[PDB]
Structures are given as C-alpha cells and as structure tokens.
Amino acid sequence: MNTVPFTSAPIEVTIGIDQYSFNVKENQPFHGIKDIPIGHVHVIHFQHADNSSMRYGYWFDCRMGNFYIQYDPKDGLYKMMEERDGAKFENIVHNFKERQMMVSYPKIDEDDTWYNLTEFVQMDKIRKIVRKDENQFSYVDSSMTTVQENELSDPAHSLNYTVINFKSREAIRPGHEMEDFLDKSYYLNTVMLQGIFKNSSNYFGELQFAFLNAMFFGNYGSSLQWHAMIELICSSATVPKHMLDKLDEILYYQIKTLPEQYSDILLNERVWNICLYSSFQKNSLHNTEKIMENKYPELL
Amino acid sequence: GAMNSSNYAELFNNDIKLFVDDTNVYRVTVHKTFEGNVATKAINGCIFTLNPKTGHLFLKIIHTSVWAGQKRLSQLAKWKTAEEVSALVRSLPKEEQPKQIIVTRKAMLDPLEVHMLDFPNIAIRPTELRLPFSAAMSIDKLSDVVMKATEPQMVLFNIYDDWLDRISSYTAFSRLTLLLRALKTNEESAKMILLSDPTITIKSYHLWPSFTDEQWITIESQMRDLILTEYGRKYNV
Numbered sequence: 001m002n003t004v005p006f007t008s009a010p011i012e013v014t015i016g017i018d019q020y021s022f023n024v025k026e027n028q029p030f031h032g033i034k035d036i037p038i039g040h041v042h043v044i045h046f047q048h049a050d051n052s053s054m055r056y057g058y059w060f061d062c063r064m065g066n067f068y069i070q071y072d073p074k075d076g077l078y079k080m081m082e083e084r085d086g087a088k089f090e091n092i093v094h095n096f097k098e099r100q101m102m103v104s105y106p107k108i109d110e111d112d113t114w115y116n117l118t119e120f121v122q123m124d125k126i127r128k129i130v131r132k133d134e135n136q137f138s139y140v141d142s143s144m145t146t147v148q149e150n151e152l153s154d155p156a157h158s159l160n161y162t163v164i165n166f167k168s169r170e171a172i173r174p175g176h177e178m179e180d181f182l183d184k185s186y187y188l189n190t191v192m193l194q195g196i197f198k199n200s201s202n203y204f205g206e207l208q209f210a211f212l213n214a215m216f217f218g219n220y221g222s223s224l225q226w227h228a229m230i231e232l233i234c235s236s237a238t239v240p241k242h243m244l245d246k247l248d249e250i251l252y253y254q255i256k257t258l259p260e261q262y263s264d265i266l267l268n269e270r271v272w273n274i275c276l277y278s279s280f281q282k283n284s285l286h287n288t289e290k291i292m293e294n295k296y297p298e299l300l
Numbered sequence: 301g302a303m304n305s306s307n308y309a310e311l312f313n314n315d316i317k318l319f320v321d322d323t324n325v326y327r328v329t330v331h332k333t334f335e336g337n338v339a340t341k342a343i344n345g346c347i348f349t350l351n352p353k354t355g356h357l358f359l360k361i362i363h364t365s366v367w368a369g370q371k372r373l374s375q376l377a378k379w380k381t382a383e384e385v386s387a388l389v390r391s392l393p394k395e396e397q398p399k400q401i402i403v404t405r406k407a408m409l410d411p412l413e414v415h416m417l418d419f420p421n422i423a424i425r426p427t428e429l430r431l432p433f434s435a436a437m438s439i440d441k442l443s444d445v446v447m448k449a450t451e452p453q454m455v456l457f458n459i460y461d462d463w464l465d466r467i468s469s470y471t472a473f474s475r476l477t478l479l480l481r482a483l484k485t486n487e488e489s490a491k492m493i494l495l496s497d498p499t500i501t502i503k504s505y506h507l508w509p510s511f512t513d514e515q516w517i518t519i520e521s522q523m524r525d526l527i528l529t530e531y532g533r534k535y536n537v
C-alpha cells in the first residue's frame with residue numbers, strides 16, 4: 001500500500017482520490033493519503049472552495065515513483081511532484097503516519113468498483129493522451145480541449161484522444177459509402193482496432209479514461225470521446241462476442257458510479273437511446289440496459 | 301446553412317449550384333396478389349438535378365433493374381441518388397462543378413455528404429422551401445423519356461426552354477415553380493390551361509409551349525387561379 005504525502009493544505013479544498021472525496025479546511029493539519037492500493041492507476045483531484053472553477057487533478061501509478069503534493073502560491077494550485085530521494089521520502093511518510101496526519105484510502109474489501117472502472121487503463125497510455133514527458137504523472141483539468149475539439153487552441157495542453165468522425169474518409173471506404181456509414185464494422189475492426197489501437201484492451205482503456213476525465217473533471221471533450229467510442233461499437237453489426245460482453249460490464253460500472261444528479265451533464269440522450277434501442281447491439285448490453293432503465297428512465 | 305425565403309436570391313447569383321430532388325427516384329404501383337396480399341411493382345424513376353440559374357436539368361433515369369434483389373429500397377434510393385449526383389460532379393470539369401448542392405429533402409443530407417467527402421469545398425445544404433419538383437413527371441416529354449428507358453440513361457434538358465433570352469433567371473424559376481405547383485395541385489386542369497389553344501405549339505426542342513410575353517401573363521394568371529381554386533375546393537373556403 002502506497003502513500004501520497006502533502007506538504008500542507010494552505011487553501012480550503014475538496015480533495016478527490018479515485019471515487020472518494022473529502023473536505024480540507026484552510027490551514028488544516030492535512031498531510032496526505034495513505035493505504036493506496038497498488039496495482040491500479042489512480043487520480044487525485046481538487047476543487048478549490050473559493051473558486052469551484054478549474055477542477056483539476058493528476059493521474060499517477062505509485063509503482064512508477066514517489067509522488068507528493070505541494071501547494072504553489074504563485075500558480076495557485078496543488079501540484080504533484082516526484083521525490084527522487086527515496087530515503088527522504090520514506091522518512092517523511094513515516095513521520096506523518098506516526099502523527100496520524102493522513103487519511104486512509106477507504107477501500108471496502110467487497111468492493112471492486114475502482115478495478116472495474118480502470119481495468120484496461122494503463123499509465124503508459126494515459127501519458128500518450130496527455131503529453132508532458134518530463135513527469136511520470138499526468139495533469140488533467142475541466143477546461144483542457146481534445147485534438148478533435150481544436151480541429152473544429154494550445155497544443156501542449158491538449159487531450160490527444162484518437163479522432164473518431166463517422167463522416168470522414170477514414171470512416172468510409174470509396175465505393176462502400178452506404179455500407180460503411182450504416183454499418184461501422186470496417187471502421188471499428190479494421191481502421192480502429194487492427195490499425196490504430198492494435199487490440200480491444202487499448203480501445204477500452206481509452207474509453208474508460210475518457211469517461212473518468214468527463215466525470216471527475218467535468219471535461220466536455222472527454223464526454224464526447226466516451227460517447228463516440230460507445231456509439232462506434234453499438235453501430236457495428238460485426239463485433240467480437242467477448243468485446244460486447246466486456247463493453248456491457250464496462251458501461252454497467254460507469255453508469256453505476258455516475259452521480260445521480262450529474263446524469264444531465266454526463267449522459268447524451270441521443271447516443272444512449274440509439275445504442276440501447278435502435279442499434280445493431282440493442283440486445284447485447286443486458287446489464288447496462290437494466291441499470292440505465294432503473295436509474296435514469298427519464299433520459300429514455 | 302439552410303436555404304429559405306430570406307436568402308432566396310442567392311439561387312441566381314454567379315456561384316454554380318444545383319438543386320437535387322429525389323422524390324421520383326423510387327416509384328411503385330401497389331397491387332393485390334392472387335392470394336390477396338399486397339405487393340409493389342417498381343417503375344422507372346429519375347433524379348431531378350437542376351441548375352436554377354441556367355435551367356440546365358441533368359435528368360438521370362433510374363431503371364427498375366437497379367432495384368433487383370435489393371432490400372430496404374426507400375433507403376437505398378437515397379444512397380443511389382447520392383451516388384449518381386457524386387458521379388455527375390466528378391464527370392464535370394472543375395470549373396463547371398457546383399459550389400453548393402441544395403437537397404429538397406433533409407434525408408438526402410447524410411447520403412450526399414458521405415458520397416461527396418472527396419469534395420470538402422462543396423456545401424451540401426437543405427432548404428425550408430417546399431418546392432414542387434415532384435411534379436416533374438407531369439411534364440410530358442420528361443415522363444416519356446423516363447417510362448421508355450430500357451437501361452440507365454442520363455438525358456439533358458433546359459427546363460426554361462428559351463425563356464432566358466427574354467427574362468431573368470429569378471423570373472424563370474418563379475414561372476417554373478408556379479407551373480409545377482399547378483401541375484401538382486391539379487394536373488388535368490393545368491395541362492388543359494397549357495394546351496387549350498392549338499395555335500400555340502411546343503417546339504420539338506422545348507418542354508413548354510411557345511407563349512408570347514403577353515400570353516405568359518395570361519397563362520400565369522390562369523395558373524394562380526387554378527391553385528387558388530383548388531385551395532378553395534380542398535379547404536371548403
């Protein structure tokens with residue numbers, strides 16, 4: 001179990017760690033989060049109390065280094081940093097634990113929620129979507145735009161998700177216009193899976209990362225990517241059986257985790273009704289359709 | 301974006317554009333089978349592709365053989381229309397290709413956009429106007445060439461005859477839409493009006509009779525009366 005110590009908490013802030021969150025008061029004796037499960041990526045995220053604008057955060061994997069948080073009073077945010085001095089870090093953490101200055105990652109033993117949300121998400125792929133190669137962790141915030149959003153403005157600060165456009169020469173084979181537009185299997189299986197992602201695990205990893213960014217940061221672009229990747233599968237007549245079964249599980253846990261009161265800002269009526277009720281896969285997502293119909297029947 | 305009554309005059313500027321109407325591409329008669337079920341029999345159709353500034357009509361005849369063995373024909377018809385319009389654009393020299401294509405029905409937007417991805421600078425636009433182009437098969441010489449076709453065929457017409465020698469393309473389009481609206485609302489009467497005077501003939505190389513300017517005014521008035529007449533008969537006004 002790993003630890004992300006905090007130097008201090010000088011401004012009042014709501015701190016998220018994965019699907020959990022807690023309030024820290026201004027100058028409260030808070031010095032970080034312990035007992036973080038090894039084996040998964042994690043995200044630690046922030047919303048300042050005095051300006052809920054700019055929610056932001058950091059994706060990280062404690063196996064890749066020793067990371068801590070320190071508030072920067074010039075740039076006005078909590079920054080993730082790497083400590084290269086291993087013995088310094090271990091000594092810092094131990095003192096904070098002995099003084100019980102850390103909150104515990106509050107994982108219930110029955111609970112696989114975080115695994116199920118991050119099953120295919122890897123740090124190496126996060127770092128290709130979010131380009132800042134001098135750090136081992138990745139910053140994301142509410143305002144960052146995707147490459148697709150910018151085609152339609154600072155490129156160093158973009159989310160490099162795979163572009164998905166249904167009316168694009170990449171999506172549509174000359175001479176198969178109607179075929180490829182009404183059945184997107186060529187685009188899914190040949191262009192995207194065989195060609196760009198190489199395998200379904202990488203595709204699901206980007207889908208899951210886009211959902212998590214959309215939900216934790218209120219990032220609109222990430223929400224568009226997430227919906228686009230779902231629709232591309234549901235709008236394909238030929239999808240491997242194992243991919244459909246896994247997609248149903250992925251979406252089930254995403255819908256299960258969504259705040260009930262954000263379903264207006266995180267769910268696209270058109271995509272979901274199309275996917276569950278009109279698409280080729282309308283009958284292949286039993287778990288997702290049941291939780292959607294019982295939790296968000298208004299949207300449908 | 302969409303073409304409506306506010307931007308109506310853009311049709312007659314010097315940017316090449318085409319209207320595409322697909323309402324006569326897939327045509328059927330519905331009949332009873334020996335077992336008392338219902339079936340359809342397709343008949344030849346046509347794509348109506350019109351330059352409203354010059355009157356040039358590219359009439360692509362859709363022969364019933366293109367439907368053989370195909371499913372979901374009303375949906376296929378929109379994609380076949382888009383395929384043929386794209387093929388027509390590619391056949392034209394660059395300097396004759398349209399800058400805009402206006403579709404009369406919104407269901408043609410995606411099929412035509414997809415077939416025209418190679419032409420990103422050609423705008424595909426809908427219209428809010430209710431244009432009477434469905435009545436093109438009430439023009440006798442157009443209906444004749446469509447029904448006689450034994451194979452796919454493109455036939456070229458000027459739907460304005462020689463009108464542009466004497467009137468502008470705004471006025472010519474207005475005359476055309478009035479004639480088509482009349483033929484659409486009461487074909488028998490409209491044709492009666494157009495041919496009631498045997499001394500006015502249709503030249504072999506024209507679609508409409510050789511009316512003088514003064515006679516067109518009478519004709520146009522008789523057509524408005526017909527449209528108003530039918531409006532009253534329809535609504536009991």
Ligand SMILES: CSc1ncccc1C(=O)N1CCCC1
Pocket residue numbers: 214215217218219220223264265266
């Ligand atoms: C997840 S999108 C989001 N979330 C939080 C705050 C604002 C937005 C946003 O830009 N939205 C645009 C359409 C739906 C909401």
Ligand SMILES: CSc1ncccc1C(=O)N1CCCC1
Pocket residue numbers: 146148149152164165166221224225226228
């Ligand atoms: C990933 S979908 C996306 N992303 C960024 C900006 C716009 C869109 C979007 O909804 N689009 C609809 C048609 C093509 C673009």
